[PDB]
Amino acid sequence: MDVVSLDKPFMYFEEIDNELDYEPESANEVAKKLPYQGQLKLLLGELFFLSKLQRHGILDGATVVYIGSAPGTHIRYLRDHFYNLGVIIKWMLIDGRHHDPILNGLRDVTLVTRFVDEEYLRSIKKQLHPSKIILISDVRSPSTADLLSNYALQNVMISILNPVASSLKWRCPWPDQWIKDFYIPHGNKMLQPFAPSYSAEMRLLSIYTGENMRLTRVTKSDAVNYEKKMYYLNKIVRNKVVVNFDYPNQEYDYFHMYFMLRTVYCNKTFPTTKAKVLFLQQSIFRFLNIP
Ligand SMILES: Nc1ncnc2c1ncn2[C@@H]1O[C@H](CSCC[C@H](N)C(=O)O)[C@@H](O)[C@H]1O
């Protein structure tokens, strides 16, 4: 077995302290070990993000605009969690595909069947005015060109929507498929527990202060670093059994998940953090119908 003692998990990309040459053969390796794992990946990252905002006092009274939201099953859980916490939030979920009917019939959530474009983004901005907007994006078209096209759209989402915070899908194009250097919003590169086995995808979390929009350039050399850093993490780190982690499941992803969940706010008072996390994970797995 691959056992080890770890103080804490890598929470952000910059924390990954090692790299490995990418082995293309790893693409034939099982990408998922859990059923509904995708929805789980999304629920943890999104719960983490919004909890951070709650912590900063900028969630209550906001309208969360989720683009690329369908089916969005896990969103129902997120909605219930803050709704039960007494937090006032309106959800506007936009996608051209149909949403899970469990999201239907809640006066606090509006489902929209539309593929967004710069034009539509301007109409929704005019219609949401003057509520504060929190943007979440999970759109997916992928070729490098598809990616650049998506990232280009996420930047327009922010310039037009002008949100107080944003969570964007972020995956650097592969270096051997480089096209042109580009810019992405500045934010923390939140690592995702339960992401596919060899995914290099992460979530870029940002809080906007003032009227400034800071961006950062990304070049092929960064793409090379992204590849090796994410390959070492997937191949090595995520395959670790944290023996000093006293929990029903000691695999890295559960260790990483514990750290995200311990930041979530509950109505129920617990004696320890282990008790709250166990509670949250239990609730989460039950909702997703995960064993
Ligand atoms: N311009 C656009 N506007 C809205 N949705 C878009 C889009 N381009 C791609 N998408 C959507 O991005 C989605 C990618 S899958 C997203 C899964 C979703 N976040 C959930 O939690 O299940 C697709 O449903 C797709 O229709």
Curated annotation (Swiss-Prot):
Q: Which GO terms describe its biological process?
A: 7-methylguanosine mRNA capping; methylation; regulation of mRNA 3'-end processing
Q: Which UniProt keywords apply?
A: Elongation factor, Methyltransferase, mRNA capping, mRNA processing, Protein biosynthesis, RNA-binding, S-adenosyl-L-methionine, Transcription, Transferase, Virion
Q: Which GO terms describe its molecular function?
A: mRNA (nucleoside-2'-O-)-methyltransferase activity; RNA binding
Keyword RNA-binding assigned to the entry: answer is yes
Q: What is its EC number?
A: 2.1.1.57
Tell me where it resides: Virion
Annotated Pfam families: PARP_regulatory
SUPFAM superfamilies given in the database record:
S-adenosyl-L-methionine-dependent methyltransferases
Q: Give residues annotated as binding mRNA.
A: 22, 171-174, 176, 199-201, 227
Class of the enzyme per the UniProt entry, highest EC level: transferase
Q: Where does it primarily localize? A: virion
Region Binding to NPH-I: what ranges? 163-243
Positions of transmembrane segments: none
Q: Which reaction does it catalyse?
A: a 5'-end (N(7)-methyl 5'-triphosphoguanosine)-ribonucleoside in mRNA + S-adenosyl-L-methionine = a 5'-end (N(7)-methyl 5'-triphosphoguanosine)-(2'-O-methyl-ribonucleoside) in mRNA + S-adenosyl-L-homocysteine + H(+)
- InterPro entries given for it? mRNA_MeTrfase-like, Pox/kineto_cap_MeTfrase, Poxvir_cap_MeTfrase, SAM-dependent_MTases_sf
> Region Binding to Rap94: which residues?
163-291
**Catalytic site residues?**
169 (for methyltransferase activity)
- Report residues binding S-adenosyl-L-methionine: 39, 66, 68, 72, 95, 97, 116, 138
GO cellular component terms, A-Z: virion component
Return the similarity comment: Belongs to the class I-like SAM-binding methyltransferase superfamily. Poxvirus/kinetoplastid 2'-O-MTase family.
State what this protein does: Displays methyltransferase, positive regulation of the poly(A) polymerase and transcription elongation activities. Involved in the modification of both mRNA ends and in intermediate and late gene positive transcription elongation. At the mRNAs 5' end, methylates the ribose 2' OH group of the first transcribed nucleotide, thereby producing a 2'-O-methylpurine cap. At the 3' end, functions as a processivity factor which stimulates the activity of the viral poly(A) polymerase OPG063 that creates mRNA's poly(A) tail.
The subunit field of the Swiss-Prot or TrEMBL record says:
Interacts with poly(A) polymerase catalytic subunit OPG063. Interacts with OPG109 and OPG123; these interactions might help linking transcription to capping and polyadenylation.
The protein, known as:
Cap-specific mRNA (nucleoside-2'-O-)-methyltransferase
Traced from the root, the source organism's taxonomic lineage reads: Viruses, Varidnaviria, Bamfordvirae, Nucleocytoviricota, Pokkesviricetes
